[PDB]
Amino acid sequence: TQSKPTPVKPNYALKFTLAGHTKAVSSVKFSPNGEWLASSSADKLIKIWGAYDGKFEKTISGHKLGISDVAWSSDSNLLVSASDDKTLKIWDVSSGKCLKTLKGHSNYVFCCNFNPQSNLIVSGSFDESVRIWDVKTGKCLKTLPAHSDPVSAVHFNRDGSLIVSSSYDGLCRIWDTASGQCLKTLIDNPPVSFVKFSPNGKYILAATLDNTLKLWDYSKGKCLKTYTGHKNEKYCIFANFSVTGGKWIVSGSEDNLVYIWNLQTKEIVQKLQGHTDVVISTACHPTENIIASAALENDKTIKLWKSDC
Amino acid sequence: XXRAX
């Protein structure tokens, strides 16, 4: 600690390509304990892979239609999935078995997440609502009339007191978990295709279908940073904060590349080449400089990239 | 998937 390492660029390079899904991959997520990577797909399946070597581990099945999203519990023991079959399912990862089926939504379930405590699940749907579920009982606790168009994303903050949601209606809303009442609306209104809280809990990263990513201070309604240069006018593409080495913003792109920006300077520092279709999802390892990416129908693979910084 | 098209 004489010196602060200040990388100007990462050097992510392809290490593994994970094949097995028979239709478009929809989402990838690293387990909090860093051991596993979970993937969801239009093929109705969830697959589990080794986080470091990309080794296939198991297939998890039961949904009757395709899956748009999957998420881990804080202890890495449970997964939740969101499906076109209008339900979410809670899975025990070890056994691969469905523990609960969450019923209530009246259209495709698009997105999902556990809260930090992992006693709750939040979901967003084409039915335009956000629902809060009790993990233990599988019952719906609250239904929020959250938006006036499909809900593209939902994410809890670091103590689960807040939920952020995004929608095709052009709005981003922040909700008080305990009461279900709206705390704030951030608003021209192109569809907001993805939102999530930053690792520090202070900001929201929000994507819109005009080729733009924006870092917001939500308790002030102020845009601090903007990232562009990629292509995103059609799909709800995941974006990430990479914080294990240099501070980057990571996102898939409709030009089949993974984009990486310097969080502060907003400059593009790297573009990862290899996929043969839209990169719909990306994910950053919790402790190591590793990125997972996944692509749509003309590709159907997941790629693992590793960097030194 | 819905997300995929």
XYZ file of C-alpha atoms in Angstrom:
314
model
C 0.000 0.000 0.000
C 2.626 2.462 -1.050
C 0.897 2.501 -4.409
C -2.628 2.471 -5.794
C -2.839 0.254 -8.906
C -4.643 2.272 -11.575
C -5.301 0.172 -14.705
C -6.323 2.087 -17.827
C -7.591 -1.054 -19.602
C -8.532 -4.652 -18.702
C -7.443 -7.584 -20.879
C -10.367 -9.998 -20.875
C -9.564 -12.928 -23.140
C -11.703 -15.934 -24.015
C -11.038 -19.060 -21.952
C -14.128 -21.265 -22.326
C -17.224 -21.663 -24.502
C -20.148 -23.458 -22.878
C -22.535 -25.315 -25.197
C -25.624 -27.332 -24.315
C -28.703 -25.128 -24.567
C -30.878 -25.920 -27.595
C -32.429 -22.444 -27.957
C -31.459 -18.848 -27.126
C -29.823 -18.297 -23.749
C -31.663 -15.591 -21.776
C -29.614 -14.888 -18.633
C -26.433 -15.872 -16.807
C -25.594 -15.322 -13.111
C -22.623 -16.239 -10.899
C -23.438 -17.687 -7.472
C -22.577 -15.337 -4.577
C -20.028 -17.895 -3.285
C -18.220 -17.776 -6.627
C -18.507 -21.519 -7.246
C -21.146 -21.771 -9.961
C -22.648 -20.130 -13.023
C -26.364 -20.566 -13.692
C -27.938 -20.038 -17.120
C -31.547 -19.789 -18.273
C -32.867 -20.335 -21.791
C -35.830 -20.307 -24.144
C -35.335 -24.093 -24.135
C -37.211 -24.161 -20.806
C -34.059 -25.269 -19.013
C -31.696 -23.984 -16.375
C -28.109 -25.245 -16.521
C -25.362 -25.095 -13.881
C -21.668 -24.776 -14.772
C -18.366 -24.557 -12.906
C -17.599 -20.861 -12.428
C -13.859 -21.203 -13.082
C -13.577 -24.029 -15.626
C -17.005 -23.808 -17.240
C -17.504 -27.531 -16.618
C -21.091 -28.710 -17.047
C -22.650 -29.749 -13.748
C -26.386 -30.326 -14.202
C -29.605 -29.474 -16.004
C -32.625 -28.325 -14.021
C -36.080 -28.694 -15.572
C -39.789 -28.307 -14.844
C -40.976 -25.068 -16.416
C -43.549 -25.610 -19.191
C -42.302 -22.706 -21.332
C -39.121 -20.692 -21.842
C -37.274 -18.917 -19.040
C -36.303 -15.233 -19.284
C -34.320 -14.863 -16.043
C -32.740 -16.704 -13.122
C -31.309 -15.559 -9.774
C -29.421 -16.921 -6.736
C -30.203 -16.749 -3.029
C -27.534 -15.163 -0.834
C -26.310 -18.552 0.419
C -25.961 -19.970 -3.122
C -28.299 -22.830 -2.198
C -31.444 -21.664 -4.020
C -32.337 -20.369 -7.475
C -35.479 -18.614 -8.635
C -36.590 -18.590 -12.280
C -39.037 -16.448 -14.269
C -40.952 -18.117 -17.099
C -43.366 -17.490 -19.970
C -45.565 -20.093 -18.238
C -46.616 -17.228 -15.919
C -44.933 -18.697 -12.848
C -41.670 -18.434 -11.002
C -40.064 -21.521 -9.531
C -37.758 -21.913 -6.555
C -35.129 -24.615 -6.961
C -32.850 -26.422 -4.560
C -29.618 -26.307 -6.556
C -28.006 -29.329 -4.905
C -30.866 -31.727 -5.647
C -32.052 -29.894 -8.758
C -35.629 -30.175 -7.514
C -38.427 -27.602 -7.608
C -39.348 -26.552 -4.061
C -42.136 -24.073 -4.812
C -44.121 -22.757 -7.763
C -45.091 -19.088 -7.386
C -48.460 -18.468 -9.047
C -50.214 -15.125 -9.491
C -48.922 -13.290 -12.556
C -51.288 -13.288 -15.542
C -48.657 -13.064 -18.286
C -44.979 -13.827 -18.955
C -42.757 -13.424 -15.902
C -39.784 -11.430 -17.149
C -37.391 -10.826 -14.259
C -36.643 -11.907 -10.694
C -34.349 -11.547 -7.686
C -33.997 -12.558 -4.047
C -33.519 -9.884 -1.411
C -30.184 -9.932 0.511
C -31.797 -11.735 3.448
C -33.307 -14.096 0.851
C -36.586 -14.419 2.730
C -38.315 -12.652 -0.184
C -38.441 -12.786 -3.980
C -39.383 -9.885 -6.234
C -40.738 -10.436 -9.748
C -41.728 -8.320 -12.752
C -44.091 -9.369 -15.519
C -45.635 -8.580 -18.910
C -48.788 -8.152 -16.813
C -47.266 -4.813 -15.776
C -47.070 -5.630 -12.073
C -44.266 -6.187 -9.599
C -44.917 -8.958 -7.078
C -43.276 -9.693 -3.727
C -43.206 -13.311 -2.574
C -42.543 -15.114 0.693
C -39.810 -17.673 -0.014
C -40.762 -19.905 2.922
C -44.434 -20.279 1.966
C -44.364 -19.476 -1.752
C -47.263 -17.081 -1.228
C -47.620 -13.683 -2.862
C -47.320 -11.033 -0.171
C -47.812 -7.905 -2.267
C -48.858 -6.986 -5.783
C -47.781 -3.556 -6.972
C -49.546 -1.915 -9.909
C -46.035 -0.800 -10.797
C -46.172 0.210 -14.457
C -48.315 0.611 -17.570
C -46.272 -1.774 -19.753
C -44.195 -4.954 -19.318
C -41.730 -4.807 -16.417
C -38.205 -5.399 -17.714
C -36.237 -5.506 -14.442
C -36.455 -5.647 -10.639
C -33.659 -5.483 -8.064
C -33.421 -5.133 -4.271
C -30.979 -2.755 -2.621
C -28.349 -4.018 -0.199
C -30.592 -4.376 2.864
C -33.745 -5.153 0.906
C -35.521 -2.013 2.082
C -35.871 -0.770 -1.509
C -36.907 -2.260 -4.850
C -36.062 -0.669 -8.184
C -38.109 -1.510 -11.274
C -37.884 -0.583 -14.942
C -40.464 -0.758 -17.703
C -41.315 -0.364 -21.369
C -43.477 2.556 -20.221
C -40.272 4.591 -20.027
C -40.155 4.836 -16.251
C -37.856 3.761 -13.458
C -39.497 3.498 -10.038
C -38.171 2.940 -6.526
C -40.396 1.157 -4.034
C -40.445 0.843 -0.257
C -40.392 -2.913 0.312
C -42.256 -2.906 3.638
C -45.249 -0.850 2.455
C -45.206 -1.403 -1.295
C -45.649 2.324 -1.810
C -43.697 4.173 -4.515
C -40.882 6.356 -3.189
C -39.729 7.919 -6.454
C -40.212 7.988 -10.218
C -37.391 8.915 -12.602
C -38.479 10.081 -16.061
C -38.662 11.854 -23.548
C -39.386 8.321 -22.348
C -37.835 5.507 -24.402
C -38.351 2.018 -22.924
C -36.102 1.386 -19.913
C -34.857 -2.145 -20.580
C -32.803 -2.786 -17.428
C -32.029 -1.320 -14.003
C -30.039 -2.407 -10.969
C -28.560 -0.873 -7.813
C -24.807 -0.284 -7.751
C -22.557 -2.416 -5.474
C -22.315 0.493 -3.022
C -26.092 0.923 -2.935
C -25.913 4.597 -3.866
C -26.717 4.549 -7.591
C -28.873 2.840 -10.188
C -27.503 1.707 -13.543
C -30.294 2.021 -16.115
C -30.458 1.016 -19.782
C -32.869 2.400 -22.369
C -33.672 1.225 -25.902
C -31.859 4.179 -27.462
C -28.368 2.682 -27.269
C -27.725 4.271 -23.866
C -26.637 3.348 -20.343
C -26.918 5.886 -17.506
C -25.663 6.001 -13.934
C -28.147 7.786 -11.676
C -28.036 9.200 -8.172
C -31.636 8.286 -7.399
C -32.051 10.178 -4.121
C -31.351 13.301 -6.194
C -32.708 12.404 -9.631
C -29.351 13.342 -11.129
C -27.547 11.591 -13.979
C -23.842 11.291 -13.167
C -22.467 9.217 -16.034
C -23.578 8.054 -19.466
C -22.201 5.212 -21.568
C -22.723 4.726 -25.289
C -21.081 3.327 -28.416
C -22.844 -0.026 -28.215
C -26.056 -1.161 -29.915
C -29.296 -1.625 -27.953
C -32.666 -0.723 -29.510
C -34.533 -4.012 -29.260
C -33.617 -6.401 -26.437
C -33.565 -6.163 -22.662
C -29.821 -6.632 -22.155
C -28.279 -7.075 -18.692
C -25.612 -4.591 -17.550
C -23.107 -4.898 -14.681
C -20.677 -3.141 -12.372
C -17.267 -4.819 -12.446
C -15.511 -4.038 -9.177
C -13.058 -6.893 -8.558
C -10.211 -5.065 -10.311
C -10.617 -1.841 -12.247
C -13.993 -0.098 -11.994
C -15.838 -0.935 -15.218
C -19.326 -0.984 -16.677
C -20.066 -4.157 -18.634
C -22.882 -4.851 -21.094
C -23.922 -7.093 -23.948
C -24.727 -5.548 -27.308
C -26.848 -6.153 -30.399
C -23.700 -6.123 -32.563
C -22.605 -9.414 -30.949
C -19.891 -7.783 -28.810
C -19.377 -7.399 -25.062
C -18.670 -3.756 -24.196
C -16.564 -2.604 -21.258
C -16.384 1.054 -20.185
C -14.274 2.911 -17.663
C -16.904 3.762 -15.043
C -15.511 7.246 -14.315
C -14.231 8.460 -17.702
C -17.061 6.786 -19.644
C -14.595 5.716 -22.357
C -14.764 2.254 -23.929
C -11.724 0.284 -22.766
C -12.465 -3.077 -24.381
C -14.827 -4.915 -26.722
C -14.989 -8.702 -26.496
C -15.338 -10.491 -29.830
C -16.544 -14.052 -30.366
C -20.320 -14.406 -30.090
C -22.335 -14.868 -33.303
C -25.598 -13.337 -32.088
C -26.866 -10.555 -29.816
C -25.160 -10.699 -26.433
C -28.301 -10.671 -24.295
C -26.664 -11.213 -20.921
C -23.387 -10.612 -19.113
C -22.288 -11.259 -15.522
C -19.248 -10.443 -13.376
C -17.713 -12.903 -10.890
C -18.057 -11.756 -7.245
C -14.358 -12.121 -6.367
C -12.360 -12.886 -9.544
C -11.845 -10.897 -12.753
C -14.106 -13.152 -14.791
C -16.959 -12.241 -17.115
C -19.675 -14.565 -18.375
C -21.630 -13.709 -21.529
C -24.509 -15.398 -23.372
C -26.099 -15.018 -26.803
C -29.345 -15.533 -28.720
C -30.550 -18.063 -31.281
C -27.736 -17.971 -33.846
C -25.247 -18.700 -31.057
C -26.794 -20.337 -27.980
C -23.479 -20.530 -26.107
C -22.087 -18.992 -22.931
C -18.529 -17.627 -22.918
C -16.112 -17.201 -20.011
C -13.526 -14.429 -20.273
C -10.707 -13.745 -17.797
C -8.584 -10.632 -17.193
C -5.500 -9.696 -15.143
C -6.965 -6.463 -13.791
C -38.175 -16.836 -23.879
C -39.982 -13.489 -23.644
C -36.628 -11.766 -23.198
C -35.324 -13.589 -26.233
C -38.076 -12.335 -28.562
